[PDB]
């Protein structure tokens, strides 16, 4: 099968982020410097039973315990997060959470190693109900991954969804690329604090304070949570939540900006309308050689109003449908074929550079190699189907 239009945008996106990861399945925090700390802003969407979402906004403040003079402040940047549930008890009193966190758009603490363990003590109140959780875990602070095994030890089973505590469970594990100073790793040995206010649509408000420190090679998290004004018959207090959407509900401006460039690639005459001819050059530049009818089938997926072409608003809408949906098994196979131009089953550095050029993206040779090495588990220097699929999941 001829790679689909969305597959092409996927691959383009994977390259923009220099990662064989799924680039769509993330939720974005923006970090701004501010009086020698950082301010974090984020929007998140809790899935309800019966469809629909509960939106909240998070405003976090991050302060370092180290003096101002020993810290290289970053610019403004974003962290992309993907929080997942690997295990649970029915009652949500044992919860194993996995997170992936990557800086976008670094520092090396001698104290922060490639595998770090962590331990957390959480105490708090949600609509005056008292509880306690403990956890232990580990991760790879430079690769951006971590696992936390959580227990509720008092106040359980909780009379509210566990979901509202998820973001209160690890900032040292954010992968920061070389260009971005990592305020979190630089804070040690002393560590850092945060205070967060999450405000929900329906008026529930969850505040939390957190101390991070480092005791003899293990990170120690100490967190205080005060949740209030959650509607007593709402989906939080009645446990009618199905987890956090690993996305944003509407497209951000920077998503619209990103996708406008991906559109420009196709729009060779810049008249705002894409034809089979213009899709044709792009498809052929990726090694396909499709017929007019096949190119038309591809435009038919995008062309709502039936006039044979598509414009930018229809293109955008298709990307929104894909952001609210998910990347499929077929799309992953198609994406691999595209990367693997010579069909030998191995994605090499040279292929990445040809494909990169076909899709109007530019990576340095350090970026090209890091993108491979990260996926490359057998160490032969290339990416095979199995390695690719692991990364994409
Ligand atoms: Ca055009
Ligand atoms: Ca149209
Ligand atoms: Ca190859
Ligand atoms: Ca390999």
Author numbering: 6 to 110, 121 to 184, 188 to 411
Authors' description from the paper:
Genetically encoded calcium ion (Ca2+) indicators (GECIs) are indispensable tools for measuring Ca2+ dynamics and neuronal activities in vitro and in vivo. Red fluorescent protein (RFP)-based GECIs have inherent advantages relative to green fluorescent protein-based GECIs due to the longer wavelength light used for excitation. The other distinctive feature of K-GECO1 is the use of the ckkap peptide as the CaM binding partner for the Ca2+-binding motif.
The crystal structure reveals the distinctive features of the ckkap/CaM complex in K-GECO1 (and presumably in other ckkap-based GECIs) relative to other RS20/CaM-based GECIs, including R-GECO1, RCaMP, and GCaMP6. The major difference is that the binding orientation of the ckkap peptide to the CaM domain is opposite to that of RS20 to CaM. Examination of the molecular interactions between the protein and the chromophore at the circular permutation site provides insights into the mechanism of Ca2+-dependent fluorescence modulation. We reason that Asn32 plays a critical role in communicating the Ca2+-dependent conformational change in the ckkap/CaM domain to the chromophore in the cpRFP domain. Saturation mutagenesis of Asn32 of K-GECO1 resulted in a library of variants that all had dimmer fluorescence and/or a smaller Ca2+-induced fluorescence intensity fold change. These results indicate that Asn is the optimal residue in this position.
